[PDB]
Design a protein around this ligand. Structure first.
Ligand SMILES: CCCCCCCCCCCCCCCCCC(=O)OC[C@H](CO[C@@H]1O[C@H](CO[C@H]2O[C@H](CO)[C@H](O)[C@H](O)[C@H]2O)[C@H](O)[C@H](O)[C@H]1O)OC(=O)CCCCCCCCCCCCCCCCC
Ligand code: CL7
Ligand code: CL7
Ligand code: CL7
Ligand code: CL7
Ligand code: CL7
Ligand SMILES: C=Cc1c(C)c2cc3nc(c4c5[nH]c(cc6nc(cc1[nH]2)C(C)=C6CC)c(C)c5C(=O)[C@@H]4C(=O)OC)[C@@H](CCC(=O)OC/C=C(\C)CCC[C@H](C)CCC[C@H](C)CCCC(C)C)[C@@H]3C
Ligand SMILES: CCCCCCCCCCCCCCCCCC(=O)OC[C@H](CO[C@@H]1O[C@H](CO)[C@H](O)[C@H](O)[C@H]1O)OC(=O)CCCCCCCCCCCCCCCCC
Ligand SMILES: CCCCCCCCCCCCCCCC(=O)OC[C@H](COP(=O)(O)OC[C@@H](O)CO)OC(=O)CCCCCCCCCCCCCCC
Ligand SMILES: CC1=CCCC(C)(C)[C@H]1/C=C/C(C)=C/C=C/C(C)=C/C=C/C=C(C)/C=C/C=C(C)/C=C/C1=C(C)CCCC1(C)C
Ligand SMILES: CC1=CCCC(C)(C)[C@H]1/C=C/C(C)=C/C=C/C(C)=C/C=C/C=C(C)/C=C/C=C(C)/C=C\C1=C(C)CCCC1(C)C
Ligand SMILES: [Fe+2]
Lengths: 284, 31, 323, 35, 65, 28, 479, 36, 68, 31, 28
């Protein structure tokens, strides 16, 4: 009953309402920090110079936006990959102006996510069950790390990271499509197949069980495995596109015998990408 | 008139009413 | 025993596959739809309707073949092989895009036949036909996208051409012109699909990781695990599986209502207060406004070639840019 | 007066009758065969 | 087993060649109206043959042809 | 005032989470 | 207890209480009809029938009333553009009573009466009629009840077609010209020649409701006498009311789809004087073609009837609205007051060019003034860009024929730009927003709201049909 | 005379939480459009 | 079980022949023909509305309103 | 914004909520 | 719109009278 032993028996105990565990020891502060800063910076936060051009972009509720259009703007383009802690800032108002809250939120959130995976494993151990829920959870984890961490690393700044907002997500998707043509990348096709097929198999399994309940184990194995594998693949696809290894490109493929070019659907898709791109790229 | 006049009247009508109806319903369900 | 009873028993007899009465509608229609698509990709081109090379003879790729939609001038003509357009000439029927109508209509009747088939099979086995009700969602999506949408528009030309890159063109067109991503019904559809995938994944993993060392898995351990890890858990198996059924289907139906709304240009294209506030001062910039700008750009840069029939001519001066 | 479009529709009824008749005839005939 | 092998050996390559010749002899272009690689444009007919009328589409293509 | 509507709905959601976590009827 | 989604099954085995809830639903529906019409009357502007018709004003039920006879109001005004004359003088001239308020009063009275009947039938749920001669279990014969109902509806359909629609003993129906100029409520005469199948010729409707009416009467009589067949009776489970529910829901969904088709594509039932122009009359240049031919037919521009030019505005199209842009159209671009007149544009060289009109699709369009020969002459470059074919660099005057700006010539570049944008929005018009705080963004007419709402309803009711068919066929399993 | 067909209506706690979550989430999603 | 007057009037229509059916197929063959008939009728109308079928002197459009 | 936007949101939040709470209360009062 | 508020409250009062008269629990 050493004080240290008593503490350990408290944390690694299956009688709390929510299991804490050693991974949860890191999970709780980081997640609480991320949630608190996200709430604060989503309700009210100054406009952020996303383009690093002294011109700001607002995203908070008190500055005009609603839930659909509000967001937490990524840290400024001038910062690059530099960590921007509050104590490493010239002035609080400036630190907000450069987009520090985004950095705070995403870093605490990513650490909390990986610790949450660890906590899942730990409790599976403490209860005496095979410890592979965490393996399945590793897929959406990979996806978030792709959009928030790996893509900015490949692109050199967190200004290319995903905004934390509903409309920011769509803006990110369209700019990503413009610059990398993700639709014609096979890994995203695997991901689309994964989500749609996962819904299909979920509906089929639920209908069958709920209809007759009024190797079969391999059935549930396949249920678990299919969408997880596809999400791993599409997360890897995003990560590869973060290193300028873009998808397929079939523009200007068929040419007339004399030398003219006959259009195909890929050219229409490329022209749509061209529109998205030229609307992007403020200057050149 | 007051834009909040209608809202105040509606909430005054509604809140005690839903309270009373809830009490009566959870009384009558019981034997 | 009249001819009808003989026919019925013959249909219901066990074979490698089950035909049933539904088969009489499903198999010919499904087979014709598939054959129409294969023919349209292999041989027929869209050089006369969209001015594209969407066939293998043209030299296209598997990702660029497409049974392209009929021309714009035909409106919503059914394009029968013997109609006022084709007039019995097979080649003109193909060039005008009649293969699109052939494939889509026979696909509709194949889907109807499949739902009837599931009704019939559940009737034979003697279990609740939740499978048919589940399949009702895909039929809603199909009817909303391939029939109601082009019917609410000017012509079949605006329907999704059967393909891969053609469907991608349809997605980008919908974003550019209807701003679909901002539609709440599409948001419910996305939530339904992603939640269905989530449910499949975690249900499979849980059942695998609570297996008894021999239904067949420790429901008690699974319940406690999820309660103490996530907070909430299913304590009922029937509810668990009905929920798995319910979520993706509901997502599909919500998206279907979203798609029928945009078929009438009854689209959630903008937020009025944001437009007003942006008009007042030019400094006010949010992600929604930049999405609007992207939509303007995509419309301008895609319209001259997507809707080639309209003979749009936009010079370089009028094309929006980030200057 | 008959127009080309109406005549086409009449030929459609002919062809549809033929298709349905051949399908139903095949089904009923084969069902009767292996009684 | 063995018997059907004779029939399939005699037939399947004949069908394969049937499709092969259907493409090679240029019959497909006539059947489906698909232009020959030189038929997309003349030496200067670089305009597109797009149908503008619903009622007389086949004749208009005949003009485009 | 929209901000008040959004914040009120959100606070109600959080309260619902609190009650759904710590006050669920015991499974049995 | 029952789950919250099955609470109403407690009337499945009780014919009396089932009838009671049907009567209550009928009372609600009639009450809504009355209340909605009352609200529309209380928010209406009868002064302007030309540049502010009912469809511009967000009316929903008024066009449906007006379709088959009701035009005037007890306050006097008619919708056809004349104060109502009490042409009624005798019995069979109730026309002075059945104005909008008369219909409202009758519907509210029906609502009350049906509510009272519903209460009565709820209390007296155990009338002897619901029970057979010698069995305690209530049991109704659905086939004969269907026959009786069908016979009643056939009689009413035949009466509607032959008396009301023909105008023999009724107001007739709304008819109009191909361009929505003259709108009468006149009787129609039925003709069985094939052109009565033209959906835009009203003579079909009467011809339908007569013949179809008779067809129902026969169809009623047969079912009032003929028994079902064991085969069908067992297959469809005619002893179980759930099958009636399934089939009725399917029928109603099909009806909704057909109605949406007619509403969106226009027909004789939906005239543009009532519900507004379709979205295809803008696409096909229907009104622009007509006007251009009329002016080209020697008439001067100022002599063009203003309804015919209002129809050529694109703000009237039902395909320019939004899902959450609420209220009447006049809450949008504002209420029109005057037509500025047909504008024409000329460049420095004096060549006459035209502005390309914005299609239904585009929320915004690039303004491009092009030579009639297909060569772009001038334009308005993007928000801030340097140009070579430009508005000012080339210089453009605009001159207006007819209307408020008659004979005028604006060469002020902001003025030319404003009227260029107006010209690409159809016909230039005087719009007021100060009265209503209008938002400048468009809204859809009555036609669009009908199409959208009932397409959604039909889509949902198909799923309802599938579910209830499933619960009928699988009845032994669903318990 | 009492009606046999009367039956009570049941909704346990878990169902209440599920319903409230559905309602609140739908309200949050659609308010941004209702305010337009 | 009140023995009202209106109940006396209507009970014969309510459940005199409740649960009675004729054996076999009965009129079902005849019904078949009727269905096929309407299956043409509706079809024709659709095509007439669709401008697939063009009846002589029947211009399916707004021009047919001429005469009112 | 729409003056009725807040009212619509409030009624949407409230009516199903009071319905559900009433059902649960008259369930829980009963044994 | 005040008229609507007044009329709605009044109609609710009349409905209350109807239910209080014809649907009171039997005294005993
Ligand atoms: C859930 C599961 C459900 C299962 C569903 C199974 C479906 C099986 C397949 C059915 C196929 C139906 C194809 C219908 C084709 C069609 O419609 O053909 C189209 C025609 C209308 O034709 C169009 O009409 C428009 C209006 O023109 C009119 O006005 C013009 C001037 O503007 C001209 O004057 C012109 O002459 C005049 O016709 C334009 O002309 C278009 O160019 C022209 O194509 O409709 C018509 O014939 C008939 C219209 C009425 C009946 C329509 C019923 C079905 C559609 C209902 C939903 C409509 C959706 C609306 C948007 C939502
Ligand atoms: C416009 C370009 C485009 C189109 C048209 C398009 N996609 Mg995508 N697309 C997909 C489907 C899809 C379908 C079915 C589809 C057609 O219907 C499309 N797409 C279409 C999915 C397979 C896949 C996305 C699936 C997906 O969402 O992946 C998981 C990603 C995340 C963030 C999961 C988050 C996990 C976190 C632990 C959550 C915990 C925090 C939470 C607050 C906790 C709350 C708890 C409590 C309080 C309630 C996808 C992607 C993705 C992208 C991108 C850039 C795109 N896309 C782009 C497109 C991914 O990065 C991305 C990708 O692959 O990277 C992972
Ligand atoms: C008197 C002559 C006649 C008339 C006018 C008439 N009936 Mg009948 N009739 C019925 C309804 C009815 C209605 C609703 C109705 C008026 O609208 C009529 N009838 C009218 C049913 C109650 C009953 C049998 C019910 C019954 O089984 O009907 C057949 C079954 C079904 C599923 C209907 C088929 C519907 C398809 C799913 C539609 C799919 C649409 C498609 C996707 C796209 C369309 C394309 C288009 C362009 C072509 C009936 C009978 C029956 C008969 C007979 C002989 C009749 N009738 C006769 C008539 C039965 O055997 C028989 C009987 O048993 O009498 C007691
Ligand atoms: C949504 C698809 C659908 C349609 C359109 C539909 N049903 Mg059902 N349906 C019934 C009647 C019915 C009628 C008379 C009818 C056509 O008029 C329909 N249905 C139609 C009852 C016999 C039976 C029980 C009914 C029953 O229990 O209803 C209880 C419902 C309650 C307390 C509220 C539900 C909330 C709604 C959001 C109401 C919103 C207001 C309204 C929208 C205003 C617009 C009016 C109009 C335009 C819609 C039934 C069921 C049931 C279901 C389900 C899933 C459905 N349905 C579904 C449908 C049962 O479980 C269940 C079942 O049978 O399980 C045993
Ligand atoms: C009686 C001969 C005839 C037939 C059968 C007939 N009408 Mg009329 N007919 C209408 C509908 C109608 C329908 C829906 C319908 C068949 O379903 C018919 N009619 C049929 C309404 C649009 C319109 C008003 C009907 C109208 O408002 O009826 C009142 C509505 C209800 C619920 C009455 C409630 C009954 C009490 C609670 C008991 C109408 C008219 C009117 C006339 C006249 C003279 C007629 N009719 C005549 C007919 C108006 O003055 C009058 C008119 O237009 O004055 C300008
Ligand atoms: C409550 C009584 C009522 C009913 C049942 C009703 N209306 Mg109205 N109604 C209209 C259509 C309508 C349709 C198509 C329709 C049936 O489907 C109804 N209405 C029904 C429009 C023509 C017209 C304004 C258009 C208009 O504002 O339409 C409504 C706009 C919107 C964003 C609602 C869409 C809501 C989403 C689908 C919600 C679904 C959530 C999901 C399921 C979960 C109208 C009005 C209006 C009013 C008022 C007071 C009403 N109403 C009232 C009603 C206008 O101010 C006003 C008026 O008369 O002056 C303009
Ligand atoms: C692209 C996505 C997608 C595909 C390809 C798909 C495919 C399938 N779904 C089925 C079922 C289901 N899907 C369901 C829910 C869903 N289904 C979903 C998404 C899809 N479902 C989603 C997201 C859900 C969640 C709600 C359920 C509940 C079921 C089933 O019960 C059923 C099955 O049994 O599953 C195993 C099978 C139906 C078999 C059939 O009709 O044969 C008959 C064939 C016919 C009728 C021909 C159809 C012709 C089509 C419509 C048009 C032409 C298509 C071309 C030939 C190919 C074009 C390809 C290009 C576009 C690239 C088939 C494996
Ligand atoms: C069927 C629905 C079943 C589900 C239950 C209902 C779901 C939730 C519905 C919420 C409605 C909220 C209305 C908000 C009104 C508003 O903001 O402005 C309030 C608006 C009126 O708006 C006012 O109009 C005035 C002029 O009259 C002025 O313009 C004002 O400025 C303006 O605010 O109110 C209405 O329009 C009320 C009637 C709404 C009719 C809706 C018809 C369409 C229904 C489609 C159903 C599809 C279902 C698909 C399901 C999947
Ligand atoms: C005209 C006036 C109309 C007024 C409004 C009427 C409103 C009626 C009530 C509407 C709401 C009903 C809710 C019932 C809720 C309820 O009790 O559900 C639980 C219930 C359980 O059914 P059982 O038969 O097991 O038990 C029934 C009893 O518990 C209750 O009757 O199942 C369903 O209702 C099936 C559908 C579930 C639907 C919800 C599934 C999704 C939940 C999560 C979604 C939101 C989160 C998304 C995150 C991204
Ligand atoms: C499968 C796959 C994944 C792994 C790699 C691998 C290379 C193996 C790859 C396979 C690739 C290959 C070579 C696939 C070959 C696919 C093809 C072309 C299959 C095609 C079958 C063709 C069919 C049905 C055509 C049927 C045509 C029909 C009815 C015609 C219908 C008709 C129409 C269209 C017009 C009117 C007249 C008529 C007759 C009614
Ligand atoms: C009681 C009495 C007896 C003797 C005669 C006398 C006349 C005195 C009689 C009195 C009768 C009177 C005054 C009757 C009045 C009846 C009335 C006003 C009935 C009600 C009509 C209102 C209805 C349906 C409600 C519709 C509301 C719905 C859909 C719910 C949601 C809505 C839907 C789903 C569509 C979009 C809009 C909205 C609001 C979201
Ligand atoms: Fe399972």
């Amino acid at each position: 009953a050493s004080a240290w032993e008593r503490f350990c028996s408290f944390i690694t105990s299956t009688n709390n309402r929510l299991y804490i565990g050693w991974f949860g020891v890191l999970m709780i502060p980081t997640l609480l920090t991320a949630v608190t800063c996200f709430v604060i910076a989503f309700i009210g936060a100054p406009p952020v110079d996303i383009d690093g051009i002294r011109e700001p972009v607002a995203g908070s509720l008190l500055y005009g936006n609603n839930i659909i259009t509000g967001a937490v703007v990524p840290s400024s383009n001038a910062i690059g990959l530099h960590l921007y802690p509050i104590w490493e800032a010239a002035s609080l108002d400036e630190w907000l102006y450069n987009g520090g809250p985004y950095q705070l939120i995403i870093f605490h959130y990513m650490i909390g996510c990986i610790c949450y995976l660890g906590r899942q494993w730990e409790y599976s151990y403490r209860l005496g069950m095979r410890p592979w829920i965490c393996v399945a959870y590793s897929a959406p984890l990979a996806a978030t790390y792709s959009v928030f961490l790996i893509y900015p690393l490949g692109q050199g700044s967190f200004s290319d990271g995903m905004p934390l907002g509903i409309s920011g997500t769509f803006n990110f998707m369209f700019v990503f499509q413009a610059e990398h043509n993700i639709l014609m990348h096979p890994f995203h096709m695997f991901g689309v197949a994964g989500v749609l097929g996962g819904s299909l198999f979920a509906a089929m399994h639920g209908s069958l069980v709920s209809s007759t309940l009024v190797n079969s184990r391999s059935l549930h194995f396949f249920l678990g495995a299919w969408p997880v594998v596809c999400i791993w693949l599409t997360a890897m696809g995003i990560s590869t596109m973060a290193f300028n290894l873009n998808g397929f490109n079939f523009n200007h493929s068929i040419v007339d015998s004399q030398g003219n070019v006959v259009n195909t659907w890929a050219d229409v898709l490329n022209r749509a990408n061209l529109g998205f791109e030229v609307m992007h790229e403020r200057n050149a | 008139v007051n834009d909040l006049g209608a809202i105040a009247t509606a909430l005054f009508v509604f809140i005690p009413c839903v309270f009373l109806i809830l009490l009566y319903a959870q009384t009558a369900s019981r034997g | 025993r009249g001819w009808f009873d003989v026919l019925d028993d013959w249909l219901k007899r066990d074979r490698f596959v089950f035909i049933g009465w539904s088969g009489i509608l499903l198999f010919p229609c499904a087979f014709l739809s598939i054959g129409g698509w294969f023919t349209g990709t292999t041989f027929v081109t869209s050089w006369y309707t969209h001015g594209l090379a969407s066939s293998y003879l043209e030299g296209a790729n598997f990702l660029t073949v497409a049974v392209s939609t009929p021309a714009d001038s035909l409106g919503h003509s059914l394009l029968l092989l013997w109609g006022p357009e084709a007039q019995g000439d097979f080649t003109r029927w193909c060039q005008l895009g009649g293969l699109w109508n052939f494939t889509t209509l026979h696909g509709v009747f194949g889907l109807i036949g499949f739902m009837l088939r599931q009704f019939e099979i559940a009737r034979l086995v003697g279990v609740r036909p939740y499978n048919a009700v589940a399949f009702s969602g895909p039929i809603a999506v199909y009817v909303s996208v391939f029939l109601m949408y082009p019917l609410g528009q000017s012509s079949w030309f605006f329907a999704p051409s059967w393909g891969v890159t053609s469907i991608f063109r349809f997605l980008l067109f919908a974003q550019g012109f209807h701003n679909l991503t901002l539609n709440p019904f599409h948001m419910m559809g996305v939530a339904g699909i992603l939640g269905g995938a989530l449910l499949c994944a975690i249900h499979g993993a849980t059942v695998e990781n609570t297996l008894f060392e021999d239904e067949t898995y420790s429901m008690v351990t699974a319940n406690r695990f999820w309660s103490q890890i996530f907070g909430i858990a299913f304590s009922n198996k029937r509810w668990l599986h009905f929920f798995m059924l319910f979520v993706p289907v509901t997502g599909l139906w919500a998206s279907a209502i979203g798609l029928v709304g945009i078929a009438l240009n009854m689209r959630a294209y903008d937020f009025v207060s944001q437009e007003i506030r942006a008009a007042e001062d030019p400094e006010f910039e949010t992600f929604y406004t930049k999405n609007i700008l992207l939509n303007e750009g995509l419309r301008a840069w895609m319209a001259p070639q997507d809707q080639i029939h309209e003979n749009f001519i936009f010079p370089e001066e009028v094309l929006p840019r980030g200057n | 007066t008959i127009t080309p479009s109406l005549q086409g529709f009449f030929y459609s009824i002919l062809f549809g009758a033929i298709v349905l008749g051949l399908l139903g005839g095949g089904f009923i005939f084969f069902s009767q065969k292996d009684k | 087993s063995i018997r059907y092998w004779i029939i399939h050996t005699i037939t399947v390559p004949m069908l394969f060649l049937a499709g092969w010749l259907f493409v090679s002899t240029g019959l497909a272009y006539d059947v489906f109206g698909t232009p020959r690689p030189n038929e997309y444009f003349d030496q200067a007919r670089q305009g597109l043959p797009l149908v503008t009328d619903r009622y007389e589409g086949k004749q208009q293509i005949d003009e485009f042809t | 005032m929209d901000v008040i509507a959004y914040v009120f709905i959100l606070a109600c959601i959080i309260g619902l989470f609190f009650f759904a976590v710590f006050f669920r009827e015991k499974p049995t | 207890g029952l789950p919250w989604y099955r609470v109403h099954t407690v009337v499945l085995n009780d014919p009396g209480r089932l009838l009671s809830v049907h009567l209550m639903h009928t009372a609600l529906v009639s009450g809504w009809a009355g209340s909605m019409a009352l609200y529309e009357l209380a928010k209406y502007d009868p002064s302007d029938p030309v540049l502010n018709p009912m469809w511009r004003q967000g009316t929903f039920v008024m066009p449906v009333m007006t379709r088959i006879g009701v035009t005037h109001s007890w306050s006097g005004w008619t919708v056809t553009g004349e104060p109502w004359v009490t042409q009624p003088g005798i019995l069979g001239a109730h026309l002075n009573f059945f104005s909008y308020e008369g219909v409202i009063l009758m519907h509210i009275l029906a609502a009350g009466l049906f509510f009272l009947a519903a209460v009565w039938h709820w209390i007296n749920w155990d009338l002897d009629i619901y029970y057979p001669d010698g069995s305690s279990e209530p049991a109704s014969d659905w086939p004969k009840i269907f026959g009786l109902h069908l016979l009643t509806l056939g009689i009413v359909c035949f009466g509607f077609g032959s008396l009301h629609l023909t105008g023999i003993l009724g107001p007739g129906m709304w008819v109009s010209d191909p361009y929505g100029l003259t709108g009468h409520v006149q009787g129609v005469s039925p003709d069985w020649r094939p052109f009565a199948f033209d959906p835009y010729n009203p003579t079909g409707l009467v011809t339908h409701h007569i013949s179809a009416g008779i067809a129902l009467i026969i169809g009623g009589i047969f079912h009032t006498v003929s028994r079902p067949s064991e085969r069908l009776y067992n297959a469809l489970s005619m002893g179980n009311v759930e099958t009636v529910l399934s089939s009725s829901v399917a029928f109603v969904a099909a009806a909704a789809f057909v109605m949406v088709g007619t509403m969106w594509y226009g027909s004789a039932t939906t005239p543009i004087e009532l519900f507004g122009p379709t979205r295809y009359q803008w696409d096909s240049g229907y009104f622009q073609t007509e006007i251009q031919r009329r002016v080209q037919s020697g008439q001067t521009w100022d002599q063009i009837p203003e309804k015919l030019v209002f129809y050529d505005y694109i703000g009237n199209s039902p395909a320019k609205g939004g899902l959450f842009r609420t209220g009447a159209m006049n809450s949008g671009d504002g209420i029109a007051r005057a037509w500025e007149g047909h504008p024409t544009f000329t460049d420095s060289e004096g060549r006459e060019l035209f502005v390309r009109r914005m299609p239904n699709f585009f929320e915004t369009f690039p303004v491009v003034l092009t030579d009639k020969d297909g060569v772009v002459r001038a334009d308005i470059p993007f928000r801030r860009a340097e140009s070579r074919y430009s508005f000012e660099q080339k210089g453009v005057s605009v001159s207006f024929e007819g209307g408020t700006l008659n004979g005028q010539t604006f060469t002020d570049a902001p003025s030319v730009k404003k009227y260029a944008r107006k010209a690409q929005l159809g016909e230039p018009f005087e719009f007021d927003r100060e009265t209503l705080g209008s938002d400048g963004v468009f809204r859809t007419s009555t036609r669009g709201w009908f199409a959208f709402s009932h397409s959604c309803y039909a889509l949902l009711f198909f799923f309802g049909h599938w579910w209830h068919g499933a619960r009928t066929i699988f009845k032994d399993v669903f318990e | 005379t009492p009606n046999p067909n009367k039956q009570p209506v049941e909704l346990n706690r878990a169902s209440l939480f599920i319903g409230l979550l559905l309602v609140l989430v739908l309200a949050l999603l659609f308010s941004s459009y209702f305010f337009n | 079980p009140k023995q009202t007057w209106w109940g006396d009037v209507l009970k014969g229509n309510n459940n005199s022949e409740a649960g009675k059916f004729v054996p076999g197929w009965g009129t079902t063959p005849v019904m078949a023909g009727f269905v096929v008939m309407i299956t043409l009728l509706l079809l024709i109308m659709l095509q007439v509305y669709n401008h697939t079928i063009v009846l002589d002197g029947v211009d399916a459009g707004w021009t047919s309103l001429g005469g009112f």
